[PDB]
Design an enzyme around this catalytic site. Structure first.
Site, PDB file in Angstrom:
ATOM      1  CG  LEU A  29      -2.212  -0.989   1.334  1.00  0.00           C
ATOM      2  CD1 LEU A  29      -2.618  -1.325   2.595  1.00  0.00           C
ATOM      3  CD2 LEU A  29      -3.004  -0.629   0.031  1.00  0.00           C
ATOM      4  N   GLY A  30       2.138   1.224   0.479  1.00  0.00           N
ATOM      5  CA  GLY A  30       2.954   2.347   0.649  1.00  0.00           C
ATOM      6  C   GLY A  30       4.258   2.009   1.488  1.00  0.00           C
ATOM      7  CG  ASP A  32       2.557  16.132   7.206  1.00  0.00           C
ATOM      8  OD1 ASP A  32       2.566  17.099   6.455  1.00  0.00           O
ATOM      9  OD2 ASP A  32       2.961  15.136   6.933  1.00  0.00           O
ATOM     10  CG  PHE A  50       7.206   5.266   8.072  1.00  0.00           C
ATOM     11  CD1 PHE A  50       6.589   3.890   7.975  1.00  0.00           C
ATOM     12  CD2 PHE A  50       6.661   6.038   6.798  1.00  0.00           C
ATOM     13  CE1 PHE A  50       5.500   3.628   6.975  1.00  0.00           C
ATOM     14  CE2 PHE A  50       5.809   5.769   5.880  1.00  0.00           C
ATOM     15  CZ  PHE A  50       5.041   4.421   5.988  1.00  0.00           C
ATOM     16  N   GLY A  51       9.334   2.957   7.365  1.00  0.00           N
ATOM     17  CA  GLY A  51       8.820   1.448   7.237  1.00  0.00           C
ATOM     18  C   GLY A  51       8.003   1.247   6.150  1.00  0.00           C
TER      19      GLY A  51
HETATM   20  C1  LIG Z   1      -0.623   4.327   2.750  1.00  0.00           C
HETATM   21  C2  LIG Z   1      -1.472   4.921   3.268  1.00  0.00           C
HETATM   22  N1  LIG Z   1      -1.980   4.379   4.621  1.00  0.00           N
HETATM   23  C3  LIG Z   1      -1.283   4.876   5.731  1.00  0.00           C
HETATM   24  C4  LIG Z   1      -0.131   5.591   6.001  1.00  0.00           C
HETATM   25  C5  LIG Z   1       0.614   5.951   7.216  1.00  0.00           C
HETATM   26  C6  LIG Z   1       2.019   6.606   7.141  1.00  0.00           C
HETATM   27  O1  LIG Z   1      -0.174   5.675   8.410  1.00  0.00           O
HETATM   28  S1  LIG Z   1      -2.259   4.442   7.206  1.00  0.00           S
HETATM   29  C7  LIG Z   1      -3.420   3.726   6.185  1.00  0.00           C
HETATM   30  C8  LIG Z   1      -4.539   3.175   6.547  1.00  0.00           C
HETATM   31  C9  LIG Z   1      -5.304   2.479   5.633  1.00  0.00           C
HETATM   32  C10 LIG Z   1      -5.209   2.791   4.305  1.00  0.00           C
HETATM   33  O2  LIG Z   1      -5.922   1.977   3.396  1.00  0.00           O
HETATM   34  C11 LIG Z   1      -5.645   1.984   1.992  1.00  0.00           C
HETATM   35  C12 LIG Z   1      -3.981   3.305   3.934  1.00  0.00           C
HETATM   36  C13 LIG Z   1      -3.030   3.854   4.654  1.00  0.00           C
END
Ligand SMILES: CCN1/C(=C/C(C)=O)Sc2ccc(OC)cc21
EC number: 2.7.12.1
Length: 353
Positions: free
Chosen positions: A36-37, A157, A41-42
């Site tokens: 997802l990302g 932020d 940080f990780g």
């Molecule tokens: C990657 C974005 N993201 C987060 C990022 C951080 C830095 O916390 S926390 C989060 C929760 C659900 C989501 O669903 C798609 C996305 C989601």
């Protein structure tokens, strides 16, 4: 892979990231199924929660590095406060379902959401959100951060990337030979409380992403909840036009754009700032006839000039935005006040739910 075996076979890379791929498990419970990302940080991965009937979660896995671990502990404290105070889950801050320490990696499980509002705008070729969508997303942000502000917290932020649709499924308006897109459900959630600060805690000096950063932060005059109000104003502009209000990456130019768009910086803020090198005899140092001078001259006009329509709903939007973009954080509208602004007479009952 098998739950028990996978959760106990574990190792990090030289950088303190958990070595893991799609198919790996954590806590004999979470099965990684997607990416997802990631950042410094990780990483954030989509998992099936096999202890909650394979429901979907976003699991943030923090690096095994003391600075990021400590930051994550503080983030969890914020999320716990939000959960404690929102028993009906109606204040639209991302739902933390679980947290744990996995071999030094702090991990936080969240409800799975849809695309962030920046990603959606970009997929729409930066064609803006229609005004009724701007209005509903504005109402939701005021509601969510008013709740956070009542709990001695500031996000610090807020940006479109940290605002996600619950469900980002879109309708096509037209597809001529960019496909013009509107989101079906404008319900949002606020994510990433990783910079969120309690009133009594250490305040990082330079907070927020450039484009959403307020003048009291640039000028190092101290900041609190009004920081987030400024951010929201900048976000609403960007929803409404599809481009950022302050397209700059340098403080002096940023402050010049603020004065061209919003009017003169209050005298007392210039008097008090340690950032004296940006000023001469109380005025911003700025060459109007340089290339950057001409870009600012051509592109940064009084706020009202950016209205697309002259009707009441647009005039009301710009009044609220102006109140959110007050230079002096002490005069800036609070979100409790913003919720009462006549801009929100244009909501429906579904939109108030
Ligand atoms: C990657 C974005 N993201 C987060 C990022 C951080 C830095 O916390 S926390 C989060 C929760 C659900 C989501 O669903 C798609 C996305 C989601």
């Amino acid at each position: 892979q098998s739950s028990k075996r996978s959760s106990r076979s574990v190792e990090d890379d030289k950088e303190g990231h958990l070595v893991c791929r799609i198919g790996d498990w954590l806590q004999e419970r979470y099965e990684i199924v997607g990416n997802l990302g990631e950042g410094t940080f990780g990483k954030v991965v989509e998992c099936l929660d096999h202890a909650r009937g394979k429901s979907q979660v976003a699991l943030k896995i923090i690096r095994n590095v003391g600075k990021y671990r400590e930051a994550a502990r503080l983030e969890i404290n914020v999320l716990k406060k939000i959960k404690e105070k929102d028993k009906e889950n109606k204040f639209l801050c991302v739902l933390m379902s679980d947290w744990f320490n996995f071999h030094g990696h702090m991990c936080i499980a969240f409800e799975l959401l849809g695309k962030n509002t920046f990603e959606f705008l970009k997929e729409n070729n930066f064609q803006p959100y229609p005004l009724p969508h701007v209005r509903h997303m504005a109402y939701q942000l005021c509601h969510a951060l008013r709740f956070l502000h009542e709990n001695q917290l500031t996000h610090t932020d807020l940006k479109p990337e940290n605002i996600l649709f619950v469900n980002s499924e879109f309708e096509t308006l037209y597809n001529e030979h960019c496909e013009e897109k509107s989101v079906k459900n404008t319900s949002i959630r606020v994510v990433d409380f990783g910079s969120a600060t309690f009133d009594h805690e250490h305040h990082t000096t330079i907070v927020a992403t450039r484009h959403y950063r307020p003048p009291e932060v640039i000028l190092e005059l101290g900041w609190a909840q009004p920081c987030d109000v400024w951010s929201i104003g900048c976000i609403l502009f960007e929803y409404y036009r599809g481009f950022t209000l302050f397209q700059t990456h340098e403080n002096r130019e940023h402050l010049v754009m603020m004065e061209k768009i919003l009017g003169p910086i209050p005298s007392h803020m210039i008097h008090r700032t340690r950032k004296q090198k940006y000023f001469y005899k109380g005025g911003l140092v700025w060459d109007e006839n340089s290339s950057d001078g001409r870009y600012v001259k051509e592109n940064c006009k009084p706020l009202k000039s950016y209205m697309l329509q002259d009707s009441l709903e647009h005039v009301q939007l710009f009044d609220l935005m102006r109140r959110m973009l007050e230079f002096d954080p002490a005069q800036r509208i609070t979100l409790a006040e913003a919720l009462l602004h006549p801009f929100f007479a244009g909501l429906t009952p579904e939109e108030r739910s």
